[PDB]
Amino acid sequence: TEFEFPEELKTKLQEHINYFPKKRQAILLCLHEIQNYYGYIPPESLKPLADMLELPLNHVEGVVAFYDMFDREDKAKYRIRVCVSIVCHLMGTNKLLKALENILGIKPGEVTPDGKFKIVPVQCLGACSEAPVFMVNDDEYKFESEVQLNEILSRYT
Amino acid sequence: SYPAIPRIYAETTLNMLLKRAKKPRVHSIDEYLKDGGYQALEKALNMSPEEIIDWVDKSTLRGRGGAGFPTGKKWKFAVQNPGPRYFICNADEMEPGTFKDRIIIERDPHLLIEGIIISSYAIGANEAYIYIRGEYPAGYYILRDAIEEAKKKGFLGKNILGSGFDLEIYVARGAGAYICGEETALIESLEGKRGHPRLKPPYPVQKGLWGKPTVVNNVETIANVPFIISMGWEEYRYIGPSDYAGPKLFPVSGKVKKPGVYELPMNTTLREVIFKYAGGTLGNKKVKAVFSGALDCFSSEELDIPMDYSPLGFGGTGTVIVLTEEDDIVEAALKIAEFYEHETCGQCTPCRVGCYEQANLLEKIYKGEATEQDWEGFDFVNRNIQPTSICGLGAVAGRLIRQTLEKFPEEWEKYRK
Ligand SMILES: Cc1cc2nc3c(=O)[nH]c(=O)nc-3n(C[C@H](O)[C@H](O)[C@H](O)COP(=O)(O)O)c2cc1C
Ligand code: SF4
Ligand code: FES
Ligand SMILES: [Cl-]
Ligand code: NA
């Protein structure tokens, strides 16, 4: 049957849509919410959302494709966004990636066998003074050492 | 309860934008009000919109977002056009080294909201927007909750403090396009479309959000507004040099002992920023070069320049990335090339191919896989990104890298071999 949103999701989506003066302005908050729920943007989920937004599907797809943050390719509970830009690279992005490889056994762009962690190479995260920087979903941290990183990641279950 | 944020070091000599934000925690409305907050708003709502515009103009407040456009004048241009109008606070950061705006948003959200309300009232906007990057979730939730705080204290909503002025502030989110920081693209995203900039003119202050006069202003710009109203434009123009007056946030990063955001006046030298305030270099290694975000490159011989918007001044957003004698200038330029590779939106052909190929060939140069044609090609591509570009990204993608070829040729020659 027609794919449909769980009500604990559809409630939030409906809230986002009513937040702005025009429904269409909600598209990015809906996608953030959809990816937060599913661990990725299910292709199946865009048709219902287009209806919800009173926008064409091809518009919605075109938007998903354009924005780096949205992934319709790979599922992951937790996205380790690793900053690879100028400052983080100078201050030891590599030692962070090395530690991530050692602990999780995956390189940038890859997902752990349990689909728990995906490492995502991103541009500057806006905490250059706390370099090298990474996020674990919404949580943002300075990398200090492998032992320090191992402890943080233990907090994600 | 908000997500984890690293506690960037903050230090001020003026005790204005960072008076609260120097302490690395959320300051909620009762604290803001206790430092006399929203009193500038009360004062402003008892002046006419036109007189606020005058004060902001006489202040000499300039855009903090990298344009250095005189803020008072931007507002004048907005209000020449018929209402209704919209005020947008550019919460998008993206540019590397730049983390000044996040410490206002995350620590003193109310300074920003007060700024947005006064500025909105000045241009007669009854609807305002904060477009905050998606990599700032804490800032998103902190702004949403802090706006709710302002609503309940009756600073937002309809007929605010019996003034007759209506304002809602809406918080939209990015999803990882840098170009969404360029003011026309930001509006395209707010309208629920791809972050593709518009051909100018029309300019936003004439045709912007749904073709209505639109003021887009940087987080740091809007943060200055309450001070101008509260202190008076005379007392504000007294801070630092009269021609580029007021407090400035300098995000300092790289090989310095005390990296963080510094609130200084703009007659501070780039040497003062690094060595007096930022506590000098790591290992006291000689400074090699300073990168002004992804915009410019200054050598160790240009440290004596003011941090103001003047021609021979530092300018930009006041972003200071410090490299020492032991840092590869080429490897650095590669990482600036790779930034512009990712963040060209691909509308304009020289920019789309130029930004990508610059990075592709420089990567080959850096790895010692470059043919002599890839070298000649890298050089040509770099000087041919600007042509046809309808926004500043194409104009600047090759700028920094060119300066490094000019100022450090010996280090680039190491890579020719
Ligand atoms: C490609 C590009 C990206 C930009 N990104 C940002 C940004 O992240 N933040 C910002 O405040 N201004 C950014 N700007 C500058 C804006 O075009 C504009 O100058 C600014 O939003 C106006 O604020 P101001 O008057 O306070 O300077 C960018 C400009 C361009 C061309
Ligand atoms: S110059 Fe580059 S980033 Fe700017 S609109 Fe053209 S293609 Fe997009
Ligand atoms: S360079 Fe990594 S956060 Fe900016
Ligand atoms: Cl104040
Ligand atoms: Na964005």
Author numbering:
A (entry chain A): 4 to 160
B (entry chain B): 3 to 419
Quoted from the paper:
Complex I couples the transfer of two electrons from NADH to ubiquinone (Q) with the translocation of four protons across the membrane. The L-shaped complex is structured into a peripheral arm that protrudes into the aqueous milieu and catalyzes electron transfer with one FMN and 8–10 iron–sulfur ([Fe–S]) clusters, and a membrane arm embedded in the lipid bilayer that mediates proton translocation. We have determined structures of the electron-input module of complex I from the hyperthermophilic bacterium Aquifex aeolicus, encompassing subunits NuoE and NuoF that contain the FMN cofactor, the [4Fe–4S] cluster N3, and the [2Fe–2S] cluster N1a, respectively, both in the air-oxidized and dithionite-reduced states at resolutions up to 1.8 Å. Here, we show that the redox state of N1a regulates NADH oxidation in complex I by inducing a conformational change close to the NADH-binding site.
To ensure that the methionine residue at the homologous position in the E. coli complex does not change the local structure, we generated, purified, and crystallized the A. aeolicus S96MF variant. The mutation did not impose any substantial structural changes, although the hydroxyl group of the original S96 is no longer available for hydrogen bonding to the peptide carbonyl of D94. In addition, the larger side chain of the methionine residue displaces two water molecules, while another water molecule shows up in a different position.
